[PDB]
Amino acid sequence: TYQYNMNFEKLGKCIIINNKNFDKVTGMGVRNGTDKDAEALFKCFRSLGFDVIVYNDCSCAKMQDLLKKASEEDHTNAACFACILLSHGEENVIYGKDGVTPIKDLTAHFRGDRCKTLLEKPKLFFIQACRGTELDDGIQ
Amino acid sequence: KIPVEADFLFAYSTVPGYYSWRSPGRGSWFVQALCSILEEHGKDLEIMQILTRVNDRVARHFESQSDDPHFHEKKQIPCVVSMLTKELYFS
């Protein structure tokens, strides 16, 4: 009564967006190490039971289309849905290869009124990106 | 009827306004921590227990090394946003 129903044929889809190289217009640098992260995440989320697909150097439009199209698939037989975003970021926004898109615009495709097959099911987003320019100096 | 915004979870690598750290040789701090916890406990622990332990490991195990002293010895805490209505186990 207090756990999500996991009795489905599939755990679910997991989309990994792995943005390493950015257009010169953006002025953002190469994200070395993000390939080791994607492979590690690929094996972990695979091992959890997800059907993982990695998409490399996406544009903002590809990112909105991948997530819009995933939203419109049929999840009747999936328990949940996961999306992992690895890219450059600023507050509330994520970098494509070409520019920024608001994180809210990627996730809104999965709201209860826009994806009935994930109603009452967890939708998980893991975001490795910057959210501003502040630094945490720490304290002993 | 149920709310349209229910049953999302956002696991961010860092808190709003802050940088997020990446080691080019070993990967980003958050992902190293996440995969390490998941490899050891992904099928035992509830998602909030998993992510809380990820929070702990990023907070304690990592401290930046940079040539720039303005970027030296900095720290990071990830940040979880939960609209979940139930406990989540991958089981």
């Binding site: 953002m28 600023e90 | 997020s20 750290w21 990446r22 080019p24 090394q65 940079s66």
Partner: peptide
């Protein structure tokens, strides 16, 4: 280590 702009 590096960060994920210097605005």
């Amino acid at each position: 280590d590096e960060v994920x702009a210097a605005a």
